[PDB]
Design a protein around this ligand. Structure first.
Ligand code: N4M
Ligand code: N4M
Lengths: 315, 315, 315
């Protein structure tokens, strides 16, 4: 068996060996839980962003950054791949655990989900559950979780708080930008599942996505980070059997294509968990079908919308 | 001295530490030989493909995967380089050992060739031989080798069977697609040697090549994997002295240019070793001549033919 | 505290474990100093170039090579990023120490500058000084430093010579080409400081730059390696507060821009003091302003001048 929590805990302990270089900071709370600030009160870094993404994907993906251009404008890009897409993406990376503890709110991602079974239906669908005595969660939030929050997470994962780790970064941070663009393969897998395609049929995925510039606050960053995938994210996927419904994966087949993600988020009263899950999707995909040996291409890139979302100023 | 077998053996041992993550499976045979299934009865993975390629190149190259686009369609690409091109490519990676043991047929690549001297002329031409007590071979086949096959390989390499490792994957597999596009620098070195240019004059090489989708069977896969290099493989090479003959390196100088490699394989009765070796060539090269300081560019990319070979379906 | 000398010394010790693979050769002098030849009397390699660049950047950057195309012509590129740009680029990588010992001259880069404080004004500007018992210098030179040179460097750094390391390569070598293109982020940081922008405002940078072919002598190579950045180097930067003066970062805003650098240099009778210092600058930048959340784009790519500089011969 592969344990996404045990594998990710090893990555976190490596992060902790390089705190200063990565521009992150950890603290152990009164109950023993370790909270790793990756961008709330510290800058974080590109490498912290890569490692945060690797942790979100349960250690079952390769994630790197390459610098390239869009209409000659330079950007950093995530390039990533996985041969465990259901587990890495739906069983771990998906932000499927809404954290609310009194006034503390966070979007919860990562391996801890596979112990707490959040949401239960995902684990039924992908036929995975972790078995571990350590839990690693990734929280997207503008505040660090305290003892009571970590005690709750530990309890839900059936682990002692002394064996829980949380990575934390806000949407508007370099770790935020990198880890969200690092969901490019996940966007495809998630949309495929939403339209009814069995994620257990997905063999592998590889993706590329520009990393958003950091906008002025977390609400605006929610828009630009998501627009990276929705308007400029590319995925090559391999599946056991093709289904014609897969033409509906790309974002250009959605009723809301052309709207900046910020507008979608605003219409959901700035509540991520109130957004229709059907609205998450990659810009373009190529699907290699093992059964027929064909590769079906769907979608398109849209630099014009991306540059608007990125608040680009040309001369 | 650089020992391609000792260096590659370390990579194989690393693979053995991550079998479930890599989606590979090893077995120790009754005679002690280690057979690592990288795609016959297991899926393998992109990372197993990278490591298989590294092994084929004797541990003397860098191999990685980056996701990028061709006419906006996403593909995974190999990006690779080496500063030991004659040894890594001709002395090791080249599939120069046709394995026939009774009914068992396989294409043999990798460091073990530098112990068995297969073919002998190659080692005379590159002035290299390994001296090791371990042998590592990479077999392209749709069946795993048994004790008798491994015993034969051991005997030919003058090592004990307990000191032989085999990596094995069929042409139609992700390891197959990665490792074959991972031959992009080798294709150039191989063609240069075929046209009479001394490979000892080659200082280094760097290459890029898309990774083929997996087609519906090994016969079709032989075509699409090879067409990756012939129609869309690019190599930057450095040489000590230029020769005008190098204008004939690219595939577009062949009379058979434009033919799908599948048709070439079919014409060879689906026997790789019956293919005219003059057909192996990269699409495009740049050759930096150290003597004059000039860089000569030859060849062209051909996305149109590539997409036909890849069985792309556009909307 | 991050010690650029201690971090870089670890990278050099790694190089020393792989000399034959990297095609480098070290010598331990009578006084214990270690001189690592990376391209004077040895070929060096792409990987030795990467490691030389990492050392120049004090171990505080990520540096890799990817193969890609310019107008379809294949080149190797450096892709790199850092979240310590002031220290890594100005405090370490910049070739800011002229080493003159009798008739020996070399331009010195790398971590040892942060012990010797060369030039002092830089360390005052970036508010960094290293405190280490080891010193690591990188010399761009066509001659290896002897005992007297190394003794001098050691004394300037207040370290014993048994704890000094020098990496050395000439301009016309693969390590020269890689390490110079590996200055792409640095040339932005340096130009920014030279036009009055406080480098303490710079959060991070990410850059891409083609690696020059090796030209026929060091003088030609000085031109083509510089032109890689000036005519084809791209940088994505993040800053705390953008200033409009950053429009003057790109090389195309210099009065001397337009011809390959070798032409500019020969016209100036080989005198650096007669060339606009503002020419030494990246081709194009995108600057993410954390104040406004906008990203400002300046400059342009110039493949036509690059291909002249690179002595490209098309059919
Ligand atoms: C790229 C996105 N954007 C983004 N932006 C920022 N700033 N930060 C982030 O972390 C992300 N993450 C990304 C998204 C994709 N992550 C995410 C978003 C919202 C959620 C919301 C919910 O709370 C969540 O728990 C899920 O949507 C629930 O998921 C379910 O969807 C399915 C529900 O329907 P169903 O299963 O009943 O339908 C049939 C049922 C029939 C049967 O099989 O029995 C089926 O699927 O088979 C089910 O399979 C299960 O997997 C979850 C994850
Ligand atoms: C990119 C290429 N394509 C590619 N594709 C795939 N899917 N996997 C791979 O590993 C590679 N490697 C790459 C290449 C460049 N690597 C490679 C390619 C070709 C070779 C050898 C080639 O086959 C070539 O050099 C031939 O040996 C020359 O051909 C003659 O040499 C051979 C020697 O004669 P024989 O002893 O083989 O004669 C008989 C006669 C035939 C008969 O039996 O009917 C025999 O073998 O049985 C004979 O086969 C004859 O045809 C070696 C390595």
């Amino acid at each position: 068996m592969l344990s996404v929590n045990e594998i990710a805990a090893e990555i976190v302990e490596d992060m902790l060996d390089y705190e200063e270089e990565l521009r992150i900071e950890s603290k152990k709370l009164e109950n023993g839980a370790i909270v790793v600030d990756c961008g709330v009160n510290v800058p974080g870094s590109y490498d912290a962003g890569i490692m945060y993404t690797q942790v979100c994907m349960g250690g079952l993906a390769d994630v790197d950054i390459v610098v390239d251009t869009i209409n000659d404008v330079p950007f950093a890009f995530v390039t990533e791949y996985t041969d465990h897409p259901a587990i890495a993406c739906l069983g771990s990376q998906k932000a499927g655990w809404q954290i609310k503890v009194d006034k503390y709110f966070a979007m919860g991602s990562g391996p801890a989900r596979a112990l707490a079974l959040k949401p239960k239906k995902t684990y039924e669908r992908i036929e995975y559950e972790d078995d571990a005595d350590v839990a690693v969660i990734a929280l997207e939030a503008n505040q660090l979780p305290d003892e009571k929050v970590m005690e709750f997470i530990a309890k839900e994962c059936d682990v002692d708080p002394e064996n829980v780790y949380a990575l934390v970064a806000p949407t508007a941070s370099i770790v935020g930008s990198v880890q969200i663009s690092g969901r490019i393969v996940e966007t495809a897998i998630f949309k495929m599942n939403e339209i009814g395609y069995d994620p257990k049929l997905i063999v592998s995925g590889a993706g590329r996505c520009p990393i958003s510039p950091i906008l002025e606050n977390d609400l605006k960053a929610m828009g630009s980070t998501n627009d990276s995938m929705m308007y400029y994210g590319s995925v090559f996927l391999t599946v056991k059997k093709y289904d014609e419904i897969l033409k509906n994966v790309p974002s250009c087949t959605s009723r809301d294509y052309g709207k900046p993600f910020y507008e979608i988020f605003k219409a959901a009263n700035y509540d991520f968990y109130k957004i229709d899950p059907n609205l998450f999707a990659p810009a373009q995909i190529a699907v290699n079908d093992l059964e027929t040996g064909k590769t079906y291409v769907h979608g398109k890139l849209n630099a014009e919308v991306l540059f608007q979302s990125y608040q680009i100023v040309l001369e």
